PDB file of C-alpha atoms in Angstrom:
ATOM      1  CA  UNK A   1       0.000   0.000   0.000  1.00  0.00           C
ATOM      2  CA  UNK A   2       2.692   2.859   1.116  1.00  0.00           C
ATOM      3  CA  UNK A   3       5.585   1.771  -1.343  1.00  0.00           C
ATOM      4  CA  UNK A   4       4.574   1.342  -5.217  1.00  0.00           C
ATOM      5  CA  UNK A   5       7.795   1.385  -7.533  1.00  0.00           C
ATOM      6  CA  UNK A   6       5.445   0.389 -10.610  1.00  0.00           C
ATOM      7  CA  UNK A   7       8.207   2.933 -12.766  1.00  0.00           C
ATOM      8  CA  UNK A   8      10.933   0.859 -12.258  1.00  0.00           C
ATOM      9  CA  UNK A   9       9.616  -2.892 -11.624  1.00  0.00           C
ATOM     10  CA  UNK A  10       7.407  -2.260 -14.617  1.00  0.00           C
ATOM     11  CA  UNK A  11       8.117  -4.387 -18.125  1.00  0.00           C
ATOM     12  CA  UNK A  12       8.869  -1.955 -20.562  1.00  0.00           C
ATOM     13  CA  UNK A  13       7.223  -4.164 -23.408  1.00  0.00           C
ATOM     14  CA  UNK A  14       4.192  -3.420 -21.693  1.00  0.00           C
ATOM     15  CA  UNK A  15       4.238   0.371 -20.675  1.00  0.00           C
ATOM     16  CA  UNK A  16       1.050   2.042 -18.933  1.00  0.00           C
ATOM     17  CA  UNK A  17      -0.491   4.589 -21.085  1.00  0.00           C
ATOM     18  CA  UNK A  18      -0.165   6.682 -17.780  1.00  0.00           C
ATOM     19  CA  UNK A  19       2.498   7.355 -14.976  1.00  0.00           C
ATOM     20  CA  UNK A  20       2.078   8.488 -11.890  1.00  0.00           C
ATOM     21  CA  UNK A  21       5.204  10.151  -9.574  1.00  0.00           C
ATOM     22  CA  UNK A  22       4.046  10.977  -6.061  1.00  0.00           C
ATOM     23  CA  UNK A  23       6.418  12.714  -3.780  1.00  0.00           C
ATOM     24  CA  UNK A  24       5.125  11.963   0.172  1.00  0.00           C
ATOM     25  CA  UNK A  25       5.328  14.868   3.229  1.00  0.00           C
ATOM     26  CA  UNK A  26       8.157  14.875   5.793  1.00  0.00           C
ATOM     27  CA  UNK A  27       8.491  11.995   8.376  1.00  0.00           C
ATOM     28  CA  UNK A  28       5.857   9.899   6.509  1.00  0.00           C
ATOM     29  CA  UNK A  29       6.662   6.263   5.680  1.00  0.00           C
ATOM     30  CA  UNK A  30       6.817   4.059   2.648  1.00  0.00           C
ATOM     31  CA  UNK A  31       6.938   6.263  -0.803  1.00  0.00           C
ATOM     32  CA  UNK A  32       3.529   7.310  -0.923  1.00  0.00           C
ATOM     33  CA  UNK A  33       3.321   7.941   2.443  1.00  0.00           C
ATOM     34  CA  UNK A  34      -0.871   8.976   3.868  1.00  0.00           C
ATOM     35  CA  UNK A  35      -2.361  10.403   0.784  1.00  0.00           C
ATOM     36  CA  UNK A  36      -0.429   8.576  -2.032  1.00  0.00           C
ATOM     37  CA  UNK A  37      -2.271   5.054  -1.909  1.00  0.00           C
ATOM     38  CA  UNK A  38      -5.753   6.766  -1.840  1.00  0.00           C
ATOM     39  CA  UNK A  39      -4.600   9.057  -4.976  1.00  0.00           C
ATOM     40  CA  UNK A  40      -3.478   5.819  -6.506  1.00  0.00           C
ATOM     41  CA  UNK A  41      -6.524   3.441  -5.824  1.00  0.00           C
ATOM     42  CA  UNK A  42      -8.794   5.881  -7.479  1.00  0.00           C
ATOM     43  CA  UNK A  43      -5.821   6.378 -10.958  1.00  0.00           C
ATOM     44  CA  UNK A  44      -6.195   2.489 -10.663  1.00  0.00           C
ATOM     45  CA  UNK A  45     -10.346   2.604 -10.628  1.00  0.00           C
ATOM     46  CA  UNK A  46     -10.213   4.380 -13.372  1.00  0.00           C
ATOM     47  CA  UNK A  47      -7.115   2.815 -15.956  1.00  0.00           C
ATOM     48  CA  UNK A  48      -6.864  -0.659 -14.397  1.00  0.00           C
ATOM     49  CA  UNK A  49      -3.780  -1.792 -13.093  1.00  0.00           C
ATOM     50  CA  UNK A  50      -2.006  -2.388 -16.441  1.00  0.00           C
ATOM     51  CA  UNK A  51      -3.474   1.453 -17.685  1.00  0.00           C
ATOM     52  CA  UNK A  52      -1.647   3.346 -14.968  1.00  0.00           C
ATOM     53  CA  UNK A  53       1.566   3.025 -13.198  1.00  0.00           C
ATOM     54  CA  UNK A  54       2.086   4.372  -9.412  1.00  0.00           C
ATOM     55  CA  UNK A  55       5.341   5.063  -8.310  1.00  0.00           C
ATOM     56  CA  UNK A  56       6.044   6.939  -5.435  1.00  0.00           C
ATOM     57  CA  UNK A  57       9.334   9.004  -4.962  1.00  0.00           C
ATOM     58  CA  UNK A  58      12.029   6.582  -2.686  1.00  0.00           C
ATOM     59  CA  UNK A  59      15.808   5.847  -3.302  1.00  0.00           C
ATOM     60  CA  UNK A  60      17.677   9.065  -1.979  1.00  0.00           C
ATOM     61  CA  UNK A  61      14.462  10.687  -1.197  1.00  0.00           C
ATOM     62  CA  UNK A  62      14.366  10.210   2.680  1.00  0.00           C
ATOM     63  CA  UNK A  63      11.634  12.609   3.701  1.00  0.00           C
ATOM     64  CA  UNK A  64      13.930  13.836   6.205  1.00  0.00           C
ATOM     65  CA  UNK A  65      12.676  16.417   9.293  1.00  0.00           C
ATOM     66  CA  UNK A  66      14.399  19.894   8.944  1.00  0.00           C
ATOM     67  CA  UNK A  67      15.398  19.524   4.984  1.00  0.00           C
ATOM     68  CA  UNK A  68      12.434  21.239   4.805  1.00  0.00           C
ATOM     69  CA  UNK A  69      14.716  24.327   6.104  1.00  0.00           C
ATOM     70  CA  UNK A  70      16.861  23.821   2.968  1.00  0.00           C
ATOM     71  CA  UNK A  71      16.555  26.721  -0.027  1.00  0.00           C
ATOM     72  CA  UNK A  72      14.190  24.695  -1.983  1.00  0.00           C
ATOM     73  CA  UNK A  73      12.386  23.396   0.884  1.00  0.00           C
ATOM     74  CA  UNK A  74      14.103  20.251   0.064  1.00  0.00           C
ATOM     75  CA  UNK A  75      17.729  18.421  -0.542  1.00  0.00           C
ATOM     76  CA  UNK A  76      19.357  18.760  -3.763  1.00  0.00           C
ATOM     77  CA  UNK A  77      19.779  14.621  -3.089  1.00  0.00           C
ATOM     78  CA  UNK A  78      15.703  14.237  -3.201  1.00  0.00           C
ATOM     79  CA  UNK A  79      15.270  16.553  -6.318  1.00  0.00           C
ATOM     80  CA  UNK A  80      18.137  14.273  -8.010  1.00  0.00           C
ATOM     81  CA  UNK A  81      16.114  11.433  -7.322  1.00  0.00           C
ATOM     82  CA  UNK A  82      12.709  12.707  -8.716  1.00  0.00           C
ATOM     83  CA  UNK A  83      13.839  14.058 -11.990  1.00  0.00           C
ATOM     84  CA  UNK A  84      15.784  10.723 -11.928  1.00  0.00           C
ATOM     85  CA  UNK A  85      12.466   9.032 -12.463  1.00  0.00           C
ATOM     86  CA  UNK A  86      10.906  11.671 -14.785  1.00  0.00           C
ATOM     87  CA  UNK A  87      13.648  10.517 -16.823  1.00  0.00           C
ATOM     88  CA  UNK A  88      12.921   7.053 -16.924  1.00  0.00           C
ATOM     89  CA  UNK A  89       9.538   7.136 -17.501  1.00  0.00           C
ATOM     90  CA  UNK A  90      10.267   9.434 -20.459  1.00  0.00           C
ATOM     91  CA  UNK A  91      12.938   6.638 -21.375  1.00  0.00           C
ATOM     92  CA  UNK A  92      11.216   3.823 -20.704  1.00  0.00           C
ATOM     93  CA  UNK A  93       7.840   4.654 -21.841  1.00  0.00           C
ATOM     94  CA  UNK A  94       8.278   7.798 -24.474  1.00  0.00           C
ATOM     95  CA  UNK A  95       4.507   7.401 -25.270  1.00  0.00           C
ATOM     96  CA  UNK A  96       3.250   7.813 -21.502  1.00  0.00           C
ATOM     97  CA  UNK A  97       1.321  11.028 -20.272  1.00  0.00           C
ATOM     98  CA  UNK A  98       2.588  11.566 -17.096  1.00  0.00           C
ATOM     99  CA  UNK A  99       0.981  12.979 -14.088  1.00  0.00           C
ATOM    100  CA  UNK A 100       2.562  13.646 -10.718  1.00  0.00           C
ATOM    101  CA  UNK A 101       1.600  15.438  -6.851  1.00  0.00           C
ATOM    102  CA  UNK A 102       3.674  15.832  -3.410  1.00  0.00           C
ATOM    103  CA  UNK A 103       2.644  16.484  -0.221  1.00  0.00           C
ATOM    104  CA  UNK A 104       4.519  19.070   2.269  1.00  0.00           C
ATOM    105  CA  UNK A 105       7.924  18.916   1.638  1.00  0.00           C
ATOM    106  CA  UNK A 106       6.975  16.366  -1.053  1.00  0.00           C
ATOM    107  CA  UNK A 107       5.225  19.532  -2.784  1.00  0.00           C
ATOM    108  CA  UNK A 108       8.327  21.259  -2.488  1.00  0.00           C
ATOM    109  CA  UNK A 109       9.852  18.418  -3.932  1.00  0.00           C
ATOM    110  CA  UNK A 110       7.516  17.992  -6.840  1.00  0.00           C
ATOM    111  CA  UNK A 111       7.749  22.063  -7.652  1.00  0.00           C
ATOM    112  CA  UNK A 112      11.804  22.227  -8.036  1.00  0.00           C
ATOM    113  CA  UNK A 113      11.542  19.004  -9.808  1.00  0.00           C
ATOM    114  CA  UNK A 114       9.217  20.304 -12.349  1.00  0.00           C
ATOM    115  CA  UNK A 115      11.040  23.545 -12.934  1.00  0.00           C
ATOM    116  CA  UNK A 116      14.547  21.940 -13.388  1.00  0.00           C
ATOM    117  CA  UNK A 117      13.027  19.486 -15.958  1.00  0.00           C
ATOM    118  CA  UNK A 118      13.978  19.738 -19.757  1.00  0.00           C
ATOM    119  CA  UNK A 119      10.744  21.189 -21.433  1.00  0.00           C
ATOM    120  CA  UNK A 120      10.202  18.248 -23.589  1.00  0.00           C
ATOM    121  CA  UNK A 121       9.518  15.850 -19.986  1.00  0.00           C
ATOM    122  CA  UNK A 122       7.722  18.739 -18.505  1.00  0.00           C
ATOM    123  CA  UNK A 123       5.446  19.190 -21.276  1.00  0.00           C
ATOM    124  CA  UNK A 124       4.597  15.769 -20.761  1.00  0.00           C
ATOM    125  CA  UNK A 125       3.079  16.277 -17.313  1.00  0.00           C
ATOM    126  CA  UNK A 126      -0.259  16.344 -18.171  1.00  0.00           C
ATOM    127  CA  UNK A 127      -1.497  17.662 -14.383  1.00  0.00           C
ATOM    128  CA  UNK A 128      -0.098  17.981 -11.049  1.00  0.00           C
ATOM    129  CA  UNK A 129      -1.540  17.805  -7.527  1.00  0.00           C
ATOM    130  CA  UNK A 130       0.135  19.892  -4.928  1.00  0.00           C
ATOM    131  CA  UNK A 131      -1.300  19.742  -1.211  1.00  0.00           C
ATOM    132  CA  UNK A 132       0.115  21.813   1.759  1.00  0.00           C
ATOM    133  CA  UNK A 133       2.372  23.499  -0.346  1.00  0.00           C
ATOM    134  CA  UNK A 134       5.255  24.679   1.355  1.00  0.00           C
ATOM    135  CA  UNK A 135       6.537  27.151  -1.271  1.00  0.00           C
ATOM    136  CA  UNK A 136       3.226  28.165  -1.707  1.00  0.00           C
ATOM    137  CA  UNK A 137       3.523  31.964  -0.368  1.00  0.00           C
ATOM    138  CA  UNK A 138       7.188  31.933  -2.110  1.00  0.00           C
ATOM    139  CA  UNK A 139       6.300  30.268  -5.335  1.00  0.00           C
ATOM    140  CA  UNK A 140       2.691  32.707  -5.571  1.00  0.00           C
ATOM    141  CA  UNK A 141       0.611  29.369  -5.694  1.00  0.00           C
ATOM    142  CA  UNK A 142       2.482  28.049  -8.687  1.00  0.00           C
ATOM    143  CA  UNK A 143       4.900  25.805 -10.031  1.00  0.00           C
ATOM    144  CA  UNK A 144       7.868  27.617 -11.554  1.00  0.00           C
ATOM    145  CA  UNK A 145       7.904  27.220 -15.535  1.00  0.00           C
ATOM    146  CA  UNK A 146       4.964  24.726 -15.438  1.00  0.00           C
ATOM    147  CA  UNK A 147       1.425  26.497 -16.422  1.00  0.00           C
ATOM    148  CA  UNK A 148      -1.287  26.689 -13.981  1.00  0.00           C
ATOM    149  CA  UNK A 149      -3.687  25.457 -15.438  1.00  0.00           C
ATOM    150  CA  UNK A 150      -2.230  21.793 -14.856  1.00  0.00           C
ATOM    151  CA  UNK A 151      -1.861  22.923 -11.652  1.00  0.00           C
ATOM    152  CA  UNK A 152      -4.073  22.039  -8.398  1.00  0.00           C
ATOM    153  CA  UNK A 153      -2.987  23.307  -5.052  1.00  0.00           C
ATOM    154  CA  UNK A 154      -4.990  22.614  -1.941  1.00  0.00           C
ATOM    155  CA  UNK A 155      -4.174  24.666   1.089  1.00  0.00           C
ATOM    156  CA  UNK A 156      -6.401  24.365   3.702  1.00  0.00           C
ATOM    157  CA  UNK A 157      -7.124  28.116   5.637  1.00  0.00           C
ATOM    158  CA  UNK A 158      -4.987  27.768   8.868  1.00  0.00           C
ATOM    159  CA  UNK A 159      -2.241  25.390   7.316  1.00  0.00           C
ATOM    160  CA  UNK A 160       0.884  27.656   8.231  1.00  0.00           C
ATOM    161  CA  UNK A 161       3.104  25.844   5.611  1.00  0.00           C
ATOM    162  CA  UNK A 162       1.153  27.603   2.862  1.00  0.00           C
ATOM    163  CA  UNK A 163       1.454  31.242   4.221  1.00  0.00           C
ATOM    164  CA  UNK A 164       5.146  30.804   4.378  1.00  0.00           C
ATOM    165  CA  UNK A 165       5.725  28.864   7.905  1.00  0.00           C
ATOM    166  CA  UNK A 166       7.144  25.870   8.204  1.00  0.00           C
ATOM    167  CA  UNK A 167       4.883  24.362  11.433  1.00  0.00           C
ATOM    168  CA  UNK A 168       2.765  21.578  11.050  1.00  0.00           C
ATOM    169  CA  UNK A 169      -0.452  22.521  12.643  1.00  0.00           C
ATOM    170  CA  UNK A 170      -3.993  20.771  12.485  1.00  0.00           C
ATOM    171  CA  UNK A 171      -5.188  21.788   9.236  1.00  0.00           C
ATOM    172  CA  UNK A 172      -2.200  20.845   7.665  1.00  0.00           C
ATOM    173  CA  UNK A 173      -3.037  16.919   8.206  1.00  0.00           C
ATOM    174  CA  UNK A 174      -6.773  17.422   6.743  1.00  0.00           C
ATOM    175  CA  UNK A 175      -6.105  16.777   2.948  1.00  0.00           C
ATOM    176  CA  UNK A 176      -7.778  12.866   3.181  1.00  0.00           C
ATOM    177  CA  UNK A 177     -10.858  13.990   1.673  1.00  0.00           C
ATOM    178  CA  UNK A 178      -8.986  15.938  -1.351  1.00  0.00           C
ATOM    179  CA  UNK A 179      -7.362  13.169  -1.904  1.00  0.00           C
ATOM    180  CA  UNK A 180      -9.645  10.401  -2.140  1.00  0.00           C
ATOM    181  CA  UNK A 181     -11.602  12.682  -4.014  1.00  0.00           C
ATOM    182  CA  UNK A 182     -11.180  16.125  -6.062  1.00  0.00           C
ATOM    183  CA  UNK A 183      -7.246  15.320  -6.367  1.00  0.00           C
ATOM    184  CA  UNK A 184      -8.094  12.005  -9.065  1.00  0.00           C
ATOM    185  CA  UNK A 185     -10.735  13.357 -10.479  1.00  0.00           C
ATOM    186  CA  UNK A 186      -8.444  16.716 -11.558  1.00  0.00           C
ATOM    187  CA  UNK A 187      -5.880  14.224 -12.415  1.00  0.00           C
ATOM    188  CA  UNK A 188      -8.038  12.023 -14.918  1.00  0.00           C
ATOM    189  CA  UNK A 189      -9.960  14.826 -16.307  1.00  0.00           C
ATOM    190  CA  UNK A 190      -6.508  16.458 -17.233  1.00  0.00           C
ATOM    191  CA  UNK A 191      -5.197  13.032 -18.974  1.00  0.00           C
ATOM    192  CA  UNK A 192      -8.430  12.030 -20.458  1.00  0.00           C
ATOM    193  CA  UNK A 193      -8.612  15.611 -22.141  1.00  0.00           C
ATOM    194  CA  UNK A 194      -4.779  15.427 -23.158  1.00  0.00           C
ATOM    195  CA  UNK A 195      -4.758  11.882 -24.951  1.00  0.00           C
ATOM    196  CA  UNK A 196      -8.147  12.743 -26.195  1.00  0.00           C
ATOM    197  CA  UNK A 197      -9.719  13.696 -29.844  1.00  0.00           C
TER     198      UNK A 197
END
């Protein structure tokens, strides 16, 4: 449920038509961490589990406490390891829309990733899910070079992280119901519209 690494274990004779890269919040466990596996199960309702791969952002990425301190609200380590896999899903699977989210300093994560991407991946990304956004205030509520309308954020009113803190408080744990629901349905909407004609 909390790891998925359906990138990289994935036959490449047999590619999804979509991949998903999912960047978890600080301190949480597995790859996909709280919200991941609910974002997934719904990707997986709707393209099967041969239409849609799920992998969630491990390897160097260690979701450490306090790296969300660091410039990018991240370490240069973790942003090495997601465009890593933006890589190889463009590699592996050229014909792939890709779609990809992060949570707290996952978001962060997710945002630098994006912006350091060659244009050819990035244009790619067919949508991307952002929730407590900890470079929200800094970033204006978008994702450097990335348009925004393929961009969702979800800040909940009283989550510090998106007015520039860095504090957890209560609201900042409440984005379960966005992601079991209005997070997919952006997501699928954006890649049934982008493959579409």
């Amino acid at each position: 449920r909390t790891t998925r690494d359906d990138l990289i274990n994935g036959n490449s004779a047999s590619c999804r038509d979509v991949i998903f890269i999912y960047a978890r919040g600080s301190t949480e466990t597995g790859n996909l961490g709280t919200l991941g596996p609910s974002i997934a199960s719904n990707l997986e309702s709707a393209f099967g589990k041969d239409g849609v791969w799920i992998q969630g952002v491990g390897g160097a990425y260690r979701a450490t406490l306090g790296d969300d301190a660091l410039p990018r609200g991240t370490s240069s380590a973790a942003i090495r390891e997601m465009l890593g896999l933006f890589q190889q899903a463009n590699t592996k699977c050229p014909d792939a829309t890709l779609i990809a989210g992060g949570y707290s300093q996952g978001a962060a994560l997710a945002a630098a990733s994006i912006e350091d991407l060659d244009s050819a991946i990035r244009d790619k990304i067919a949508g991307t899910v952002l929730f407590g956004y900890t470079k929200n205030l800094q970033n204006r509520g978008r994702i450097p070079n990335y348009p925004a309308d393929r961009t969702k954020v979800f800040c909940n009113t009283g989550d510090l992280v998106c007015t520039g803190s860095l504090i957890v408080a209560a609201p900042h744990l409440a984005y379960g119901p966005d992601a079991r629901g209005p997070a997919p349905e952006f997501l699928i909407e954006k890649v049934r519209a982008v493959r579409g004609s």
